[PDB]
RNA sequence: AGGGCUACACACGUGCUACAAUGGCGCAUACAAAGAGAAGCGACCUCGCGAGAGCAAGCGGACCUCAUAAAGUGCGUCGUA
RNA sequence: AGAACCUUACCUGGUCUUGACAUCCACGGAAGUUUUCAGAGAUGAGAAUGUGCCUUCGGGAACCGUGAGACAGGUGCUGCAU
């Protein structure tokens, strides 16, 4: 993980899009296609569309999720079985 | 190589000759321990704001004659194939082939 | 006193450069210290000989730096200057150094 | 408001003249009438002229020239002296007396490229040292030498600037 | 890839170097760079005037060229006109004060080199390989060549199947280090693809 | 710009580390060679259990730094799991 | 003789089309230097400085800008043309 002196890290875009969704009060899904973005407290409550590679996955943050990142909650392999 | 592939290389070269003085500065500023936390903040911030062709760490060693990525020797900044060649004509001072 | 250290890849030349350095100085001043020789860089590389595959197959080249001290204990003023005129072979690396 | 004046001394005791400028204001105690005293001293510019914030009553004129070792005022008469400039003695205070070259770790003299070798072979020699190894105590002085410009590892206290 | 090189064996016996100078490790590939472009550029140019070998020699940041070549009058011209104009594009090309001499080869039939360059031009202006390679080695053979080799290979004759054909003469010692053999390279870009040709010249044992 | 070349029911190639007592662990202690180093190697000292951090000499180097060689040797311990 | 980015040649999107890389004219501007908002970034829009080597003044060589084409570019195929 990163130094904890660094801090968290989140992409500036990222954080300014969370920041006009938390003064609109909306809660229509923000695309994004950062999965390095760490999740944080006030991003709870929304959906964030994170890309995957090929489309936007829908992911509604929990308070659970906050440590985490964006990327962990939008798996890029898709892999059913072998048979 | 390509001539595409060495023309980016000479530009990141450009970049990195251009951004040096402020990126370092930057970088101390992050590193610099008796500071203040808002400071460094706002350093790291800059840094991501500057062109990524600016990091050194971007451009890759290439040989000077063929621009080829792989099997790059330092002291003559040549790829083995074209410093073999080199040693063969001559061209390199003092190399000759070794034995012991 | 002055230092002076020679560096070149031919030993013959560098060894010629070395006779020529003493001579210049011998003639001007007194006491020259020698040609004291120190240890040769033998900078070695290996490289691949193929142009595609073949890792077995290589070539392994080297070149040899060698180094001569000279050294001049006294100084005069005849001396010193002297080094500027005296021209010695191509491809030596002289490096004076006064105390 | 206080306005700048210069003020002539013995060239020499210069900072005497500025202790003994600041002792007479306090003893005869217009501290209102003066607020500081440029007088530098090196082991030096200007090192003849003192800087005074003051203002002009012809009592602390008769002050100022009742301090010891002081000529008069430099102005265009000697009825009403003249001020100056704020910037003019701006410049003198910030190297006043702050710790100039001397005290160093490494530079004893000025590099850039002006310098002459003594204490060596380079008899009554000079030259211009591009590059320098003050951490390891070295110089690069290129000296005119051999028809070209090489350069010679010298001692700081070898060369001097 | 049976062979070594003739020339980079020889190195530190019989042969010399090209480029003479020393250099610290930093200022080393710079020069080697310098070195390549000076050289093509000089290649470029004295295409029309035969010339051998450039050997470039570099002291007190100023470089030294030598151009080896079998008719000076041409990469001369009038009276210093054509070598000062060569030494200023030198200069440049370097970015140091550059001085250019000039070399005059006695017997261009001996040198391998020319007559690799010679034989190229030859087959380049549509002769048969074959009449060229015989003319090159019996000329050197008349000049008092030891003896000499020439190989030439691919696409002979404008043939669909590319092939490789030499012509030796006297003797030709490759393995003995202190015979000088002078060889060289070149290569013909005719109408049908390239055709290399080699050529080995022996001049003669060297005893110390 | 982001992702992939790092995927994973599986098969093969080349290696490393093991399965221990000719050994493991602990404490002490001896003997190399050959190399690299300036956008570099970085002593000493201070702090950190440690990776390292801070300060910062010496050094384009038979000088300074990387840099304590390890197996070994002596003493202790473990006792075939 | 070293794939996090780069490398990279592959995929996904977002973009460019005389072009990232050269030469050539035409003619608009000295190059460059600093900084601003949007954008994932590529890019797309702003504020400050300069006019150097020479002219019976139809202007020039370095270095940006635009359009025309001549061309550039290709780690595209054939190692069974070399």
Redesign the interface.
């Given at each position: 993980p990163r130094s904890l002196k660094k801090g968290p890290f989140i992409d500036l875009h990222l954080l300014k899009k969370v920041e006009k969704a938390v003064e609109s009060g909306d809660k229509k899904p923000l695309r994004t296609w950062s999965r390095r973005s760490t999740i944080f407290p006030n991003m709870i409550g929304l959906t964030i569309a994170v890309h995957n590679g090929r489309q936007h996955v829908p992911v509604f943050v929990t308070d659970e999720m906050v440590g985490h990142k964006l990327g962990e909650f939008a798996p890029t392999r898709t892999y059913r079985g072998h048979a | 190589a390509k001539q595409s592939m060495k023309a980016r290389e000479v530009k990141r070269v450009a970049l990195a000759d251009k951004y040096f003085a402020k990126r370092a500065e930057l970088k101390a500023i992050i590193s610099d321990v008796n500071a203040s936390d808002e400071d460094r903040?706002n350093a790291?911030?800059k840094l991501?704001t500057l062109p990524r062709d600016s990091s050194p760490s971007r451009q890759r060693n290439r040989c000077?004659?063929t621009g080829r990525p792989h099997?790059f020797?330092?002291?003559?900044?040549?790829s083995?194939?074209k410093?073999?060649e080199?040693?063969?004509?001559?061209?390199?001072?003092?190399?000759?082939?070794?034995?012991w | 006193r002055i230092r002076i250290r020679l560096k070149a890849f031919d030993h013959r030349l560098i060894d010629q450069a070395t006779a020529e350095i003493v001579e210049t100085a011998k003639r001007t001043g007194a006491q020259v210290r020698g040609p004291i020789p120190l240890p040769t860089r033998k900078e070695r590389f290996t490289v691949l000989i193929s142009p595609h595959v073949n890792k077995d197959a290589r070539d392994q080249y080297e070149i040899r730096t060698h180094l001569r001290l000279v050294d001049i204990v006294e100084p005069t003023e005849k001396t010193v200057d002297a080094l500027m005129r005296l021209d010695l072979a191509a491809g030596v690396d002289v490096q004076i150094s006064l105390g | 408001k206080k306005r700048w004046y210069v003020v002539q001394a013995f060239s020499g005791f210069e900072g005497r003249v500025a202790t003994s400028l600041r002792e007479h204001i306090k003893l005869h105690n217009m501290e209102d009438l003066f607020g500081e005293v440029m007088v530098p001293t090196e082991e030096k510019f200007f090192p003849g002229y003192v800087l005074v914030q003051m203002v002009m009553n012809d009592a602390s004129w008769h002050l100022v020239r009742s301090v010891p070792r002081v000529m008069g005022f430099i102005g265009g008469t000697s009825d009403r002296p003249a001020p100056i400039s704020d910037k003019e003695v701006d410049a003198i205070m910030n190297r006043l007396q702050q710790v100039g070259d001397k005290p160093r770790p490494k530079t004893l003299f000025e590099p850039g490229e002006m310098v002459r070798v003594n204490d060596g072979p380079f008899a009554d020699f000079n030259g211009v040292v591009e590059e320098v190894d003050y951490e390891k105590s070295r110089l690069k002085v290129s000296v005119s030498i051999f028809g070209r410009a090489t350069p010679v590892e010298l001692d700081f206290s070898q060369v001097e600037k | 890839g049976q062979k070594v090189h003739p020339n980079g064996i020889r190195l530190g016996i019989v042969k010399p170097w090209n480029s003479t100078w020393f250099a610290n490790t930093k200022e080393f590939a710079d020069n080697l760079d310098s070195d390549f472009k000076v050289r093509q550029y000089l290649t470029k140019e004295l295409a029309k005037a035969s010339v051998s070998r450039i050997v470039i020699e570099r002291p007190a940041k100023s470089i030294r060229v030598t151009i080896h070549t079998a008719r000076p009058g041409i990469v001369i011209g009038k009276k210093g006109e054509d070598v000062e104009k060569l030494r200023k594009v030198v200069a440049d090309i370097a970015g140091v004060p550059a001085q250019i001499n000039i070399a005059e080869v006695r017997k261009p039939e001996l040198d391998a080199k020319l007559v690799a360059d010679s034989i190229t031009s030859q087959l380049e202006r549509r002769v048969m390989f074959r009449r060229a390679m015989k003319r090159a080695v019996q000329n050197a053979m008349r000049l008092g060549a030891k003896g000499i080799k020439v190989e030439v290979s691919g696409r002979l004759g404008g043939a669909e199947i590319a092939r490789t054909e030499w012509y030796r003469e006297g003797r030709v010692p490759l393995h003995t280090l202190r015979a000088d053999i002078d060889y060289n390279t070149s290569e013909a870009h005719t109408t049908y693809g390239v055709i290399g040709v080699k050529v080995w010249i022996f001049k003669g044992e060297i005893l110390g």
């Open positions: - | 903040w790291v911030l991501q000077r004659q099997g020797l330092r002291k003559f900044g040549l083995r194939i410093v073999r080199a040693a063969m004509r001559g061209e390199i001072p003092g190399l000759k082939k070794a034995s | - | - | -």
